[PDB]
């Protein structure tokens, strides 16, 4: 606990400077997300207050691209729900409460201009998926279907590349890997059933062949997803 408190104090001191905080945030985005998660994970009031202060310093307007950094954090690291939960939570430090309120306000401001298509794009860029509600609610997959085929079907090409990478990495058959593969297959099936003009693009890129080959996966969910994709291809 003492070591964690000292590390948090050092991080806060380093982030006190705006240039130093801006440099650290870009080079340690994963570390920043881990610290944000640990802020809610940790139960110590002092550690939570230090983590909130460190997050606020990185998100402070004095840092370069402060709005962009805050938006990237709220998108990739799911900072907005964590800040909302922290606001609903209770802390023994008034400074910690004020920092939590400021972080919640910043997250709300960032998410005010956010969109479901933006969340899907961020998830695709992160090359990770866990059956997000945009991939489940038909509203997003219907409104953003036209945008998927934009830029020579750039989104469809990225999804096909992600599916091919998952197929290459599917030999591990990890639970997280299986979930990601299933989510990618569902997204591909949706983007094929809606606006079927991308079927030829997927066939040319080899996505159809990869989907057909994925039917050999031992996972029952993967098998069902492959069967659904095959039915959407030529089946009924």
């Amino acid at each position: 606990i003492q070591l964690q408190y000292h590390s948090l104090l050092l991080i806060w001191l380093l982030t006190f400077n705006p240039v130093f905080a801006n440099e650290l945030v870009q080079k340690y985005l994963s570390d920043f997300l881990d610290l944000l998660k640990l802020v809610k994970i940790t139960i110590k009031e002092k550690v939570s207050r230090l983590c909130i202060s460190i997050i606020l310093q990185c998100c402070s307007t004095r840092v370069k691209q402060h709005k962009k950094v805050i938006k990237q954090l709220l998108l990739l690291g799911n900072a907005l729900p964590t800040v909302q939960s922290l606001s609903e939570r209770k802390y023994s430090d008034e400074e910690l409460r004020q920092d939590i309120s400021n972080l919640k306000e910043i997250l709300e401001n960032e998410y005010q201009e956010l969109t479901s298509f933006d969340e899907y794009v961020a998830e695709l860029d992160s090359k990770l998926l866990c059956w997000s509600p945009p991939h489940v609610d038909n509203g997003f997959w219907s409104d953003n279907i036209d945008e998927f085929k934009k830029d020579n079907y750039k989104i469809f090409r990225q999804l096909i590349e992600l599916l091919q990478a998952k197929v290459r990495n599917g030999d591990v058959n990890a639970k997280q890997e299986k979930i990601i593969i299933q989510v990618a297959l569902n997204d591909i099936t949706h983007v094929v059933e809606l606006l079927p003009e991308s079927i030829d693009v997927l066939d040319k890129t080899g996505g159809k062949a990869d989907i057909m080959e994925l039917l050999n996966h031992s996972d029952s969910r993967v098998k069902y997803e492959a069967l659904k994709a095959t039915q959407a291809i030529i089946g009924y």
Binding site: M212, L215, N216, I234
Partner: protein, 53 residues
């Protein structure tokens, strides 16, 4: 077992579709070539008639 047969059938179906597409493309070229030969005779006949006049 059955999945492999379906995958092989899909490749065969793609080949059949590709062959069908090739036949349509070949037929259009063949029809155009046949039409060109008939059109060439009419132009040659007209040119001979024009030259005679």
């Amino acid at each position: 077992n059955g999945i492999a047969t379906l995958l092989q059938a899909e490749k065969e179906a793609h080949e059949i579709v590709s062959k069908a597409r090739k036949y349509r493309q070949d037929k259009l070229k063949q029809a155009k070539t046949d039409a060109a030969k008939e059109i060439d005779s009419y132009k040659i006949q007209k040119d001979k008639e024009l030259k005679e006049f």
